Amino acid sequence: MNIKELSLHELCEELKTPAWNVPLTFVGDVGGTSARMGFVREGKNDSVHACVTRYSMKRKDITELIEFFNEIIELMPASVIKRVKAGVINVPGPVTGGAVGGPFNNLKGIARLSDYPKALFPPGRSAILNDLEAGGFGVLAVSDAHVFSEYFGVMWEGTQWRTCEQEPAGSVIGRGRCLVLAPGTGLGSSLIYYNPMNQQHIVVPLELGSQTIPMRKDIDYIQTLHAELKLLPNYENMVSGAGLEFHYRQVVRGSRPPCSAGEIAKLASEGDANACKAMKKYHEYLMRVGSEASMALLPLTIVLVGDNIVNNAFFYRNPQNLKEMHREALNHEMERFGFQSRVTYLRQKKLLNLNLMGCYRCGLDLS
Amino acid sequence: MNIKELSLHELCEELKTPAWNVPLTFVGDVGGTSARMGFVREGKNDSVHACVTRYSMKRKDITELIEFFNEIIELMPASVIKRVKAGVINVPGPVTGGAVGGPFNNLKGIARLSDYPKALFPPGRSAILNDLEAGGFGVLAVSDAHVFSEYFGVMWEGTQWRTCEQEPAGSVIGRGRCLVLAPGTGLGSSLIYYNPMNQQHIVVPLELGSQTIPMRKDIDYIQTLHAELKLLPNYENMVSGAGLEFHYRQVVRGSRPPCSAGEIAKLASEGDANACKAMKKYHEYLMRVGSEASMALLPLTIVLVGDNIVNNAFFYRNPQNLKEMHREALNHEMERFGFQSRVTYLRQKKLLNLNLMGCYRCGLDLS
Numbered sequence: 001m002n003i004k005e006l007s008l009h010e011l012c013e014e015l016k017t018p019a020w021n022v023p024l025t026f027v028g029d030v031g032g033t034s035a036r037m038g039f040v041r042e043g044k045n046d047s048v049h050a051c052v053t054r055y056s057m058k059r060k061d062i063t064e065l066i067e068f069f070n071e072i073i074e075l076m077p078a079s080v081i082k083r084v085k086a087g088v089i090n091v092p093g094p095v096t097g098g099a100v101g102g103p104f105n106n107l108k109g110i111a112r113l114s115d116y117p118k119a120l121f122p123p124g125r126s127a128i129l130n131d132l133e134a135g136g137f138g139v140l141a142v143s144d145a146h147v148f149s150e151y152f153g154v155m156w157e158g159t160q161w162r163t164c165e166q167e168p169a170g171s172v173i174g175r176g177r178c179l180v181l182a183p184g185t186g187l188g189s190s191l192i193y194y195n196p197m198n199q200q201h202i203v204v205p206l207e208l209g210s211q212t213i214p215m216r217k218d219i220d221y222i223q224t225l226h227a228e229l230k231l232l233p234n235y236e237n238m239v240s241g242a243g244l245e246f247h248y249r250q251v252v253r254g255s256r257p258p259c260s261a262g263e264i265a266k267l268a269s270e271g272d273a274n275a276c277k278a279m280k281k282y283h284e285y286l287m288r289v290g291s292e293a294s295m296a297l298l299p300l301t302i303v304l305v306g307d308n309i310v311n312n313a314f315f316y317r318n319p320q321n322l323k324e325m326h327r328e329a330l331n332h333e334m335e336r337f338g339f340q341s342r343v344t345y346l347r348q349k350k351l352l353n354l355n356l357m358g359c360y361r362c363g364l365d366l367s
Numbered sequence: 368m369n370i371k372e373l374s375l376h377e378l379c380e381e382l383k384t385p386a387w388n389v390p391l392t393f394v395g396d397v398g399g400t401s402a403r404m405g406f407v408r409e410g411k412n413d414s415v416h417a418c419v420t421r422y423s424m425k426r427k428d429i430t431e432l433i434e435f436f437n438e439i440i441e442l443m444p445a446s447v448i449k450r451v452k453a454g455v456i457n458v459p460g461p462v463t464g465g466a467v468g469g470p471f472n473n474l475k476g477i478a479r480l481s482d483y484p485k486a487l488f489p490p491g492r493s494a495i496l497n498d499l500e501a502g503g504f505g506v507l508a509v510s511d512a513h514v515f516s517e518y519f520g521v522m523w524e525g526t527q528w529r530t531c532e533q534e535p536a537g538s539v540i541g542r543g544r545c546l547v548l549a550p551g552t553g554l555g556s557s558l559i560y561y562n563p564m565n566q567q568h569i570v571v572p573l574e575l576g577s578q579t580i581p582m583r584k585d586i587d588y589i590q591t592l593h594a595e596l597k598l599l600p601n602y603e604n605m606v607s608g609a610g611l612e613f614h615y616r617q618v619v620r621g622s623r624p625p626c627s628a629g630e631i632a633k634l635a636s637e638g639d640a641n642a643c644k645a646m647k648k649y650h651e652y653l654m655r656v657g658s659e660a661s662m663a664l665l666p667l668t669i670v671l672v673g674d675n676i677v678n679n680a681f682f683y684r685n686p687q688n689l690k691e692m693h694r695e696a697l698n699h700e701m702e703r704f705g706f707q708s709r710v711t712y713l714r715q716k717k718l719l720n721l722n723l724m725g726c727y728r729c730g731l732d733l734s
């Protein structure tokens with residue numbers, strides 16, 4: 001279980017050594033800000049081994065990837081390029097047919113597998129994934145490598161965990177549906193479906209973030225945002241970078257000027273009461289995604305992923321914050337039957353590119 | 368592909384015929400009112416023959432099923448019971464692990480597979496499905512039988528259809544997600560997921576009906592029902608028999624007597640203005656489930672199913688109601704990117720026991 005971030009040239013260097021004389025998978029973790037592309041292999045002892053290189057999404061254009069791909073094929077020895085098993089990338093938008101990606105909230109353009117160089121993407125062994133589809137595959141990869149409790153932590157255990165599992169919560173993904181939520185720049189979501197027939201986990205990409213927010217006792221608050229956006233607020237409007245910024249503006253009331261999502265997270269990490277208020281308000285809405293999806297999708301577990309989640313551990317390790325999220329996760333009419341209480345909430349507690357692992361885990365299936 | 372209801376006694380006679388020496392699958396369709404149970408064999412020319420018998424759910428308790436099971440085997444040749452290779456039943460409520468079902472709105476008790484006679488339910492070859500889970504399996508079976516266009520009509524074709532498929536809308540299930548909705552007494556919902564990299568369909572049970580309804584311009588209407596229920600309304604509150612009655616009361620305001628949904632639908636078929644206005648309100652909220660799920664679950668198709676939908680066909684043939692349902696289905700902020708327009712809507716136009724044939728279908732996957 002390991003990745004090494006390299007410059008484009010040292011990447012080329014490493015790929016000629018003895019350990020890399022093995023079959024290889026091309027992977028790309030593409031975001032609205034950067035792309036991470038490179039190769040993956042195994043040694044022995046279930047060993048997950050990757051090295052990639054960062055790219056900036058300069059043009060803010062998903063089609064820029066084609067230029068990166070070419071650059072990689074020529075600038076590298078085809079003795080390596082011929083060891084390429086499969087080609088899997090993920091992108092931050094809806095993807096249909098594993099072949100077409102778009103439209104994107106961040107970038108312009110359309111991701112097209114058919115316009116991809118077949119050296120990095122062998123036909124019949126290539127996919128374009130949604131970013132949270134990739135990450136879903138990554139959660140599965142982490143589980144299979146028996147290393148779950150190294151990367152995820154229980155926030156609170158739900159009723160049903162012990163009905164399905166004797167091992168401790170957080171030690172395994174569990175034999176039930178796992179809902180993956182990635183509250184970052186945008187709000188990502190996938191359902192790791194579990195087929196009780198053959199005991200298989202199956203990643204199902206979702207767009208929960210774009211659902212219109214249903215109310216609690218917060219009609220005035222929603223209407224305030226409604227009036228700024230000129231749009232019925234969806235979950236992502238509250239749970240996102242722009243949402244966090246909004247939460248901050250509502251807290252301060254002109255008393256401090258607006259600052260960025262990033263700045264608000266840093267502030268709260270220093271005990272700023274205003275930013276902390278904003279962080280809680282953000283999490284109140286994340287939890288509403290959880291409780292509605294708890295009913296609709298019936299998960300055994302809910303997992304919060306992303307570097308965002310790892311880095312804000314100051315917020316999660318506070319028991320008053322945890323208790324309030326928990327309160328909001330149970331704030332649903334159906335809780336009078338225990339449905340939201342059934343569910344176990346975890347969060348990623350250690351850095352790991354789930355998407356790259358997932359692209360690789362996905363490539364094994366296309367193989 | 369074809370069934371026959373028989374008295375318990377004569378069903379027992381039927382199985383003794385040499386054409387029923389085939390391997391058999393025990394199936395069972397359980398609703399709040401009654402339960403139909405029987406056996407399915409396969410025949411000449413890939414034919415599928417089922418014959419079943421009926422049962423009143425008198426105590427309104429799901430455990431009552433065990434009696435019928437026992438009674439089945441006791442008043443039945445153990446010569447023919449030996450032929451049972453698979454047993455599958457559906458029940459009208461949530462189910463975990465294909466083995467534990469409940470509790471149910473319309474019945475009391477808990478369906479447990481472990482309490483069932485292994486003569487009918489052979490371990491490792493048996494399951495409990497949710498009713499829409501079975502329906503989903505049924506919808507798959509109708510498609511593979513090449514008889515889709517016979518039982519389903521296109522309400523309107525969506526944008527993605529001719530891109531993903533080559534055959535006409537309504538003639539196959541399609542290689543894409545299919546959301547099945549059963550707006551009846553309860554609101555049923557399942558998602559027939561499509562894995563684009565093994566070309567395969569998988570049935571994922573859902574409880575969409577219990578999500579809190581997000582607003583449109585209907586804050587007052589929602590507050591009204593809210594006060595009547597002393598519960599935040601969920602979609603099933605607006606879309607159900609109880610919901611249809613409620614819509615009819617808000618129409619007449621006391622000017623005419625209250626009446627059952629069944630009689631409201633009858634009244635609309637005859638052309639009562641009040642009834643037709645209730646029917647439209649009901650459908651306005653049914654379309655909202657669709658609009659919200661279209662975004663959240665990214666389906667290629669949405670299919671309305673059940674005896675209900677066939678019987679109240681009149682409502683769907685009227686091009687005026689259709690253009691209004693279609694308008695409500697596109698009533699979503701995300702439609703500015705064409706997401707609601709993507710989806711093709713279909714209705715069941717001919718009677719069929721999706722659930723019974725769903726049980727058999729599931730049974731085949733289990734062998």
Ligand SMILES: O=C(N[C@@H]1[C@@H](O)[C@H](O)[C@@H](CO)O[C@H]1O)c1ccccc1
Nearest residue numbers: 092093094105132186187188189210
């Ligand atoms: O971009 C969209 N949704 C994206 C998701 O695909 C992604 O999982 C998430 C995290 O990166 O950011 C969201 O903004 C999107 C586009 C069009 C319609 C609805 C949603």
Ligand SMILES: O=C(N[C@@H]1[C@@H](O)[C@H](O)[C@@H](CO)O[C@H]1O)c1ccccc1
Nearest residue numbers: 459460461471472499553554555556
């Ligand atoms: O009964 C429930 N849900 C049922 C569904 O499972 C069923 O598919 C549908 C059609 O029969 O009617 C709903 O009312 C139910 C019970 C408890 C919690 C959530 C849902």
